[PDB]
Structures are given as structure tokens and as C-alpha cells.
Design a protein around this ligand. Structure first.
Ligand SMILES: Cc1cc2nc3c(=O)[nH]c(=O)nc-3n(C[C@H](O)[C@H](O)[C@H](O)COP(=O)(O)OP(=O)(O)OC[C@H]3O[C@@H](n4cnc5c(N)ncnc54)[C@H](O)[C@@H]3O)c2cc1C
Ligand SMILES: Cc1cc2nc3c(=O)[nH]c(=O)nc-3n(C[C@H](O)[C@H](O)[C@H](O)COP(=O)(O)OP(=O)(O)OC[C@H]3O[C@@H](n4cnc5c(N)ncnc54)[C@H](O)[C@@H]3O)c2cc1C
Lengths: 518, 518
């Protein structure tokens, strides 16, 4: 079973569960066997006392949330809010500290507004990418959404976690506009213009007046977000996805050099993604279809996969947006930036000879169509879980290839296949390492945990820091931001103790604890 | 003279001034007659005990700032930070509360970095738009800056106040990336990746890890910003400014309807500005050159000015950016959106027959060239000060014209000329009212103060709220954001008391006081 959270009497916990049950009704308080949906689905720990949720409560309304939060204060019980809790590779729905009651906000799934003239939506945390896409299609509205690679997750939760997608609206939190928040004391606030009664501008103007605070409720335990606005891209007048491939692994140095001017200037309109061979292949193939051995793939097999699949060692999947004349012009600039590189190949969808193909999968993603089929890389090695590591770096060939060499060697010494991606947002490069592992085998869990720790350690030392991580690694990633004896987190701790003096909101999120657990 | 701030002994103040003088050296502590630079230059109050600064201290370094702040705590003296304090129409350098020691950061004017590959700058608060433009030109770097209408002011201070400009980088705070902050206790923090020692990514990636807090130091008294990064637009491959004019005052309803789709989609790349006749004329003419009477201008004079100056009743000044093919395409969409409106006229600079002309002034602004000559509207009526009122509204003809009728009537009943502007950022319309008044005449001060109060009152009631205001009106503008008995400001007060328990930072900025003055 799961243990009580330290400092919390068994009487006080059962008093809390009863008063929660009055608030949401007895049907919506979960214990015992009902609680396995809220486990980490991709186990990393070998210790079964860690990241174990104790109960779940699922309110219907903002006001029920406040009532819980007030109760949680009275009995000093901690809560762990999830919008839908489909945060795979980050912990799923599970809390950092054991003993935590999960506040599940699935049921709060109303789409309050979708406005076509102004290109926005106002949504509760329960609304998924699938629900929002389907609503938009059904009503015939000319708006695109921006989806991660799995659309069963939360428009809100993903944005609060600094999620990304693959359209020009790829920076989810950046497109957030207006929120309603239940503070850790149980008071309700609205940010920006929503603080102004009678406004029709909540989702039109981010700032409102005075200190801009939306951001303090992202990657945070300073409040529970119960409503959130997000800007939506008007349907454009044109759309052309492409794939550029490169033959050699060393190609990533010059390729990254040429993306810099294109990205900084905005000639490329979405995030640029340059994916390694195995990461792309694993969408439509598995390792055992190409190699017998338990080890990572030898070079000769890599060549086979390249020739079969029409993929390079690096694969740049992008998309043009806008009227055909603009697209033609941007394409001339993009293509010309890469033409002189030996081995380079350029494809539009018509030129892909396979009808089950990387480019045809990612054409859907790059126009905001949510889909299940990215999760296919999970099957590369017979079926397991994934871990991601995605630190930030300057957009430089030299930083690109250093990260590639550093990571690929260690991943491969550990017997995993190198699956990596060079992503660029706007001025920021991320080298994303994804490691598929057997979540059911404790010997591979020990291996993966150690590998992850080392990668983080070696990346930080070169200046590369993580921006989003798994519940398990939250403290570790916090300790990377340590300038002036951890001055930043001390300020976080100061705000935490002011908004949450009893520390009853997600103790340990982003490595923020509060005075009682510190 | 100026009075001591309430609650502060005369001994304690002179102890503070001495220990400040040890910190920055005696040359850099200002009293008595040295203190008139830091008065409000555009007097609104008739009471000479209000917004009166008591002393000024001008440190050299971040560490001097911290020392002051620690001293300020010991003796409970309040500080009012200005970067350069050239905040005209908002109070200049003056504090809301009297008695406040001005912390002047002019001397901290080093440009720490300008990076061409990555399109950013790292600047101290003392750096003006003029200094940054001149540095960029001198070193030959292909970067544009984004300037307000007066470039003698602070890249930092303007961004912290939510300032705007007229290029695609018009949203200044939005382009902010990374800051160093001295907290009200005197500790120093860096946000985002700057918290990570050895980073080369401080100005490349906004968020870093965990709660995003940059925004809490804008329009705020939660800290003193001592360094700040800002993204800079790479020099584009082309640039074509334009002016579209319209004959009738009612034209602003359809004009605003057609801008909506263009702005939401981003076809117009900079903020759209549609300026009333007098606001544009006053750049190159004065009232007395057209009309004798003390009143506002009659219609017959308006017609004269239109025919002389080749200006309409509304004037849409915009600019295309990028390679000629993209510009041609965007122009076709823009022009076609307006062609069917009776009286419409379209001009590029070549088609302006005057060599001292609105379009040739604003061509400079819309490519990031700082210039003095906007301040010319100040001379319309013989020379005075300005007040601005710029609330937010949905991008709607109906909201545009309601605001026009509401404001123009009252401004004109009060004997001022209607000078207004319809601006659009991205999804946000602002009706900006600018009122030029005689700052030296107390009867016109009473009039302007009353008018301003009424405008605010009538605009709020229709859903339109102010986002930036004069020191004098800060409390009033705060009280507009009152949903749930002022729940938002109560949270601001909570964070204020946690970061600033002794309340020694800009008491009253954005209507935030702290527990000792509340
Ligand atoms: C194969 C694979 C591919 C993926 N691809 C992508 C991708 O392309 N892009 C991407 O962004 N992600 C991606 N992810 C991660 C994940 O799938 C999505 O980000 C997912 O949408 C997040 O889960 P969710 O939306 O349910 O958010 P939630 O689980 O609801 O929220 C995530 C976290 O945010 C916090 N939180 C949530 N709601 C609130 C609230 N109301 N108040 C306060 N805090 C709150 C909590 O701490 C929670 O743990 C991928 C994962 C896998 C395994
Ligand atoms: C005719 C006219 C035209 C104008 N046109 C424009 C325009 O086009 N666009 C525009 O944006 N503005 C415009 N303004 C307003 C003003 O000219 C500029 O915004 C100006 O640059 C702001 O003053 P500053 O840059 O010195 O900032 P400061 O005076 O240094 O700062 C403004 C405020 O920010 C806060 N602050 C400053 N530095 C710090 C710090 N380090 N830490 C904490 N708080 C701090 C303070 O409360 C200060 O009062 C105009 C004004 C006039 C009169």
C-alpha cells in the first residue's frame, strides 16, 4: 500500500477524506484499488515507497476546489493537482512525495468559449487536445490547435508545464492568455483583464495592469489553475510540410549553423526539428526487424535502415505556412541554405514513396492534428517506457555535435540505442535524448537511473540546463540553477511560504518544499 | 520643500543619507536644489505636498544597490527606483508617495553584450534607446531596435512599464529575456538560465526551470532590476512604410472591422496605428496656424487641414517587412481590405508631396530609429504637457466608435481638442486619448484632472481597462481590477509583504502599498 505523508495523523487524514466526500459527494473520493491509474506508468524507481499517491479527489467546479483546499489546510493534508495527469515520461499523475492526495480535475472539462473572430479558447483543465480539436471540427470553425505528440493530454496542464508543439503556436505557455486560480489558502483570483469585472478582453491582452503573475503558476505549486485561455492560430491560406535528410552523423554541425539565421529571423515558422535515424525509423519499424543482437545497432544496419526508409542519419522535418507566394519564397531561402551539403535530399509528401512514412505522420502534427502514432518509438525494443532529457544550448554546430557525441557514447555503452533530436524554438537549441527502456526489469531501471544522473551532470558542466523533467528528478534539476547559493529557489521558497504557509500544495514540485518540509 | 515620509524620524533619515554617501561616495547623494530634475515635469496636481521626492542616490553597481537596500531596511526609509526616469506623461521620475528617496540608476549604463548571431542585447538600466542605437550603428551590426516615440528613455524602464514600439518587436516586455534583480531584502537573483552558473543561454530561453517570475518585476515594486536582456530584430531584407487615409470620422467603424482579420492572422507585422487628424497634423503644424478661437477646431478647419496636409480624419500608418515578394503579397491583402471605402487614399513615401510629412517622420519610427520629433504634438496649443489614457477593448468597429464618440465629446466640451489613436497590438485594441494641456495654469489642471477621472470612470463601465498610467492615477487604475473584492491586489499585497516586509520599495507603485502603509 501507500503510507501516510510524514507529519499527518491517520485520524486527521480520515477526517479530511470524509469532509472531501461531503464536498464532491462520496462517488468522487478514491482509495485502495481505485488508485492505480494514478501510479507512475513508466517506473524508474526500484523502491516501492516513493512517488506513491495515497488517495484521489475529483471535484466538479472551481468552488469545490476551493473547499478542498480550505479543508486541506484545516487538517494539514497535501494535495497534488493534475489537469488530466497524462504527463508521460514526467511521472504521469504521480506525486513527488508519497502520501499525497491527488486532486484530479478531469471532470472539469467544459469548453467555456471558442471565439473565431479573435482566435482564442477558454478551457477548464479537464479538456484534452482530442476534445478541443473535435469541438472545433464539429462547429466548422477555421482555427488550428497546437498539439504535442500525444493528444490525450490537457491543453492546460501541458501549457502549465511549458509544453511544446510543432506549429507556429508551438510555445504553449507563450500563447496562454488569462487564468483563474485557486490560491493555496482557497481564495480565487483571475489574472490580467479577467480581474476587471465586465471585461470582454480576458483572452485578448495578457498583462492587464501591474505585476504580470500568470507565469508564477506554471511549473509551480503556488496555485491550482481552474480556467485558462489560450490563443489559437487562424487557419492559414496554405500549408506545405517537408523533410530534408542528411547522410552523415557529422552533418549535424553544419546543419545547425545554417538553421541559426533561419530561425532567429523567423524564415522557418514552426520549431525546427532534426531527428536522429532511430528516432524516426522507430515510428514505423522495430529494432528486431533489422538486427538480432541485444546491443545497440551497428553502422551496417543503420545504412540498411536509411536505404529502406529513405531517411538520413539526420532528418529535418519542417513546414511552410501561408499563401503560396510566401511559401515559395521561404522555401527558396530554406532549400538554398542546405543544397551544397553532400548527400542532402529534399522531399515533399508527394515525393515519399512509402504510404506509411515519417513525413506523412508529421504532416498531421505540424498542422495541429492530434494522433496516437508517435508513441510507436516506444516499441523499438519490444515495448517499454521512455525518459526524456532536453537541456538548453546556444544554436551552434559546436554545441550540437558536442551534445551528440557526449550522449550517444554513454547511451550506447549502457546498451540502449541513441535516439535524439535537435530542436529549436526561436533562439534556443535543445538536444533531446529519448531513452526507451524496459520499465518492468529492475536491472534496466538501475542502469537507466544512473545513466540519466550522469547525462544531467555532464550536460550542466558544459552550460546546458534542463527546463522540464520527471517528478523523480525535480530536486536534481532545481539544484542546477544554483547561482549565488541557490538565490533563485530561496525566492521561490519565500513566495511559497507566503502563499502556502501550511505547505499543502504539491510539496516538491520543481524542487520547492515550504518551511514545514524544509 | 519636500516633507519627510510619514513614520520616518528626521534623525533616521540623515543617518540613512550618510550611510548611502559612504556607499556611493558623497558626490552621488542629492538634496535641496539638486532635486528638481526629479519633479513631475507635467504637473497635474494643484497641491504641492504630493509626489514630492525628498532626496536622490545614484549608485555605480549592482552591489551598491544592494547596500542601499540593506541600509534602507535598517532605517525604514523608502526608495523609488528609476532607470533613467524619462517616463513622460506617467510622472517622469517622481514618486507616488512624498518623502521618497529616488534611487537613480542613470550611471549604470554599460552595454554588457550585443550579440549579432543570436539577435539580443544585455543592458543595464542607464542605457537609453539613443545609446543602444548608436552603439549598434558604430559597430556595423545588422540589428534593429524597437523604440517608443522618444528615444532618450530607458530600454529597461520602458520594458518594465509594458512599453510599446512600432516594429514587429513592438511589445517590449514580451521580448525581454533574463534579468538580474535586487530583492527588497537586498539579495541578488538572476532569472531563467542566468540562475545556472556557466550558462551561455541567459538571453536565448526565457523560462529556465520552475515558476516563471520575470513578469512579477514589471509594473511592480517587488524588486530593483539591475540587468536585463532583450531580443533584437535581425535587419530584414526589405522595408516599405505606408499611409492609408480615410475622409469621414465614421470610417473608423468599418476600418476597425477590416483590421481584425489582418492583425489576428499577422498579415500586418507591426502594431496597426490609426491616428486622428489633429494628432497627426500636430507633428508639423500648430492650432493657431489654422484657427483663432480658444475653443477646439470647428469642422470647416478640419477640412482645411485635411486638404493642406494630405491627411484624412483617420490615418493608418503601417509598414511591410521582409523580401520584396512577401511585401508585395502582404500589400495586396492589406490594400484590398480597404479599397472599397469611399474617400480612401493610399500613399508610399514617394507619393507624399510634402518633404516635411507625417509618413516620413513615422518611417523612421517603424524601422527602430529613435527621434525627438514626435514630441511636436505638445506644441499644438502653444506648448504644454500631455496626459494619455489607453484602455483595452476587443477589436470591433462598435467598440472603436463608441470610444471615439464617448471621449471626443467630453474632451471637446472641456475645450481641449480631440487627439486620439486606435492602436492594435495583436488581439488587443486600444483607443488612446492624448490630452495636451497647459501645465502652468491651475484652472486647466483642475479641468484636466476632472476630465481624466470621468473618462476612466465611463470607460471602465463599458469594459475598458487601463494597462499603464501616471503615478498620480495608479491607485485609481488598480481599483478597476476589483473582481471578488479586489482578490488580485490582495495577492499582490501578500507577495509584497513576503518580499518587502518593511515596505521600503516604491510604496504605491501600481497601487501596492505593503502592511505598514495599508
Ligand atoms: C511518447 C511521448 C511523446 C510526448 N510528446 C510530447 C510533445 O510532443 N510535446 C509535449 O509538450 N509533451 C510531450 N510529451 C509529454 C506529455 O505527453 C504531454 O506534455 C502531456 O500533454 C502532458 O500531460 P497532461 O497534458 O495530462 O498534463 P497534466 O498531467 O495534467 O499536468 C502536468 C503537470 O503540470 C502540473 N499541473 C497540471 N494541472 C495543473 C493545475 N491545474 N494547477 C497546477 N499545476 C498543474 C502538475 O504538476 C502536473 O504534474 C510526450 C510524452 C510521451 C511519453
Ligand atoms: C510625447 C510622448 C510620447 C511617448 N511615446 C511613447 C511611445 O511611443 N511608447 C512608449 O512605450 N512610451 C512612450 N511614452 C512614455 C515614455 O516616453 C517612454 O515610455 C519612456 O521611455 C519611459 O521612461 P524611461 O524609459 O526613462 O523609464 P523609467 O522612467 O526609468 O521607468 C518607468 C517606471 O518603471 C519603473 N522602473 C524603472 N526602472 C526600474 C527598475 N530598474 N526596477 C523597478 N522598477 C523600475 C518605475 O516605477 C518607473 O517609474 C511617451 C511619452 C511622451 C510624453
Amino acid at each position: 500500500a501507500a503510507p501516510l505523508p510524514e507529519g499527518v495523523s491517520a485520524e486527521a487524514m480520515s477526517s479530511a477524506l470524509d469532509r472531501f466526500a461531503r464536498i464532491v459527494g462520496a462517488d468522487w473520493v478514491f482509495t485502495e484499488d481505485k488508485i492505480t491509474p494514478y501510479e507512475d506508468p513508466y517506473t524508474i524507481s526500484n523502491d516501492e515507497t516513493e512517488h506513491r499517491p495515497y488517495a484521489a479527489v475529483a471535484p466538479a467546479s472551481t468552488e469545490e476546489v476551493q473547499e478542498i483546499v480550505r479543508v486541506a489546510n484545516e487538517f494539514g493534508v497535501p494535495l497534488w493537482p493534475v489537469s488530466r495527469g497524462k504527463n508521460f515520461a514526467y511521472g504521469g499523475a504521480a506525486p513527488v512525495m508519497s502520501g499525497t492526495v491527488v486532486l484530479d480535475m478531469n471532470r472539469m472539462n467544459r469548453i467555456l468559449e471558442v471565439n473565431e473572430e479573435f482566435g482564442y479558447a477558454l478551457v477548464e483543465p479537464g479538456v484534452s487536445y482530442f476534445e478541443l480539436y473535435d469541438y472545433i471540427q464539429e462547429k466548422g470553425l477555421k482555427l488550428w490547435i497546437d498539439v504535442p505528440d500525444g493528444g490525450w493530454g490537457s491543453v492546460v496542464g501541458n501549457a502549465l508545464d511549458h509544453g511544446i508543439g510543432y506549429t507556429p503556436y508551438g510555445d504553449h505557455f507563450a500563447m496562454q492568455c488569462g487564468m483563474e486560480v485557486v490560491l493555496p489558502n482557497g481564495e480565487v483570483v483571475r489574472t490580467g483583464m479577467g480581474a476587471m469585472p465586465g471585461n470582454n478582453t480576458w483572452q485578448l491582452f495578457k498583462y492587464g495592469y501591474g505585476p504580470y503573475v500568470d507565469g508564477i503558476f506554471s511549473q509551480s505549486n503556488f496555485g491550482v489553475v481552474t480556467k485558462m485561455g489560450i490563443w489559437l492560430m487562424p487557419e492559414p491560406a496554405g500549408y506545405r510540410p517537408y523533410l530534408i535528410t542528411f547522410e552523415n552523423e557529422d552533418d549535424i554541425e553544419t546543419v545547425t549553423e545554417r538553421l541559426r539565421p533561419l530561425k532567429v529571423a523567423g524564415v522557418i515558422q514552426n520549431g525546427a526539428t532534426v531527428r536522429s535515424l532511430v528516432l524516426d525509423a522507430a515510428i514505423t519499424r522495430t529494432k528486431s526487424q533489422y538486427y538480432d543482437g541485444d546491443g545497440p545497432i551497428p553502422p551496417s544496419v543503420a545504412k540498411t535502415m536509411m536505404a529502406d526508409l529513405d531517411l538520413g542519419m539526420w532528418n529535418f522535418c519542417g513546414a511552410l505556412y501561408g499563401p503560396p507566394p510566401v511559401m515559395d519564397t521561404l522555401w527558396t531561402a530554406i532549400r538554398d541554405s542546405f543544397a551544397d551539403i553532400p548527400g542532402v535530399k529534399f522531399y515533399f509528401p508527394e515525393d515519399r514513396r512509402h504510404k506509411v512514412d515519417l513525413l506523412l505522420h508529421r504532416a498531421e502534427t505540424m498542422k495541429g492534428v492530434p494522433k496516437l502514432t508517435e508513441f510507436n518509438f516506444l516499441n523499438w525494443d519490444g515495448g517499454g517506457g521512455h525518459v526524456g532529457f532536453s537541456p538548453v544550448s546556444p544554436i551552434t554546430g559546436k554545441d550540437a555535435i558536442k551534445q551528440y557525441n557526449m550522449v550517444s557514447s554513454r547511451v550506447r555503452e549502457y546498451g540502449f540505442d541513441y535516439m535524439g533530436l535537435l530542436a529549436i524554438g526561436w533562439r534556443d537549441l535543445h538536444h533531446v535524448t529519448v531513452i526507451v527502456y524496459d520499465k518492468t526489469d529492475p536491472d534496466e531501471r538501475k542502469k537507466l537511473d544512473e545513466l540519466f544522473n550522469i547525462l544531467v551532470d555532464e550536460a550542466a558542466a558544459e552550460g546546458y540546463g534542463e527546463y522540464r523533467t520527471h517528478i523523480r528528478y525535480m530536486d536534481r534539476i532545481a539544484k542546477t540553477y544554483s547561482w549565488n547559493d541557490n538565490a533563485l529557489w530561496k525566492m521561490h521558497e519565500t513566495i511559497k511560504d507566503a502563499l502556502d504557509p501550511n505547505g499543502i500544495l504539491a510539496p516538491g514540485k520543481s524542487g520547492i518544499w515550504g518551511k514545514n518540509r524544509r
